[PDB]
Design a binder for this molecule. Sequence first.
Ligand code: ADP
Ligand code: AMP
Ligand code: ZN
Length: 215
Amino acid sequence: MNLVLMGLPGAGKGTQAEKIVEKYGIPHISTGDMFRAAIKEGTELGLKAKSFMDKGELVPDEVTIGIVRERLSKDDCKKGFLLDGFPRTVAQAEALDNILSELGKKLDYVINIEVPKEELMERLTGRRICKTCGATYHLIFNPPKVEGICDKDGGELYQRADDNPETVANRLDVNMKQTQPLLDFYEEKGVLRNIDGQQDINKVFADIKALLGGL
Ligand SMILES: Nc1ncnc2c1ncn2[C@@H]1O[C@H](COP(=O)(O)OP(=O)(O)O)[C@@H](O)[C@H]1O
Ligand SMILES: Nc1ncnc2c1ncn2[C@@H]1O[C@H](COP(=O)(O)O)[C@@H](O)[C@H]1O
Ligand SMILES: [Zn+2]
């Protein structure tokens, strides 16, 4: 089961990714998670990635492709994987095509979770994520069992530096700019499925399960 989740910041990819991996047991590969881990570790790569991430800009394709290639070479990806938030440029989708040629694999689906722009600000400003595993919550729409504490592992919940209204507006511009070229790319391959992300979390998941049951 070889999957991409795509969608604008705040659309629900992490949320759904968590549910997909619990149900099916494939690895969650999130480029955002990896970069935040790198910045927390203080790696050379993390410190270089921080400047883009703090501005809501994309990390260069070379760096991003490098981290994803390495992740995809691990044994846990041999029975499938979930890419969450990669690719985000047509160059990255082209790279992924080649990578997957080398791995003798193809994407089963690119799941595009569509949410109107106007709703994304509220999703992002109420978002809180776990320090220790990156689980995603929302203070209104999806709160933790206990305020400020992750359901899974008890980690502290925090507001991402980039989930402030100024940085969010730049993020939405930057990612929208890449969206139609990516939709067109995967529409041409015939693997793009659009999901209505303006539904109940569990309804959105129901729709994804309908796609995935076959693989
Ligand atoms: N279908 C939904 N309805 C309402 N809120 C949602 C839904 N899906 C996710 N959320 C919440 O909105 C925010 C963005 O979701 P998230 O999965 O982190 O987005 P992404 O990974 O696409 O940026 C989070 O605070 C999350 O709890
Ligand atoms: N595929 C990617 N390409 C370039 N930058 C990325 C990618 N995925 C994540 N990032 C960087 O990580 C930040 C957080 O991503 P996310 O966690 O998906 O919101 C983005 O604003 C980018 O700076
Ligand atoms: Zn956690």
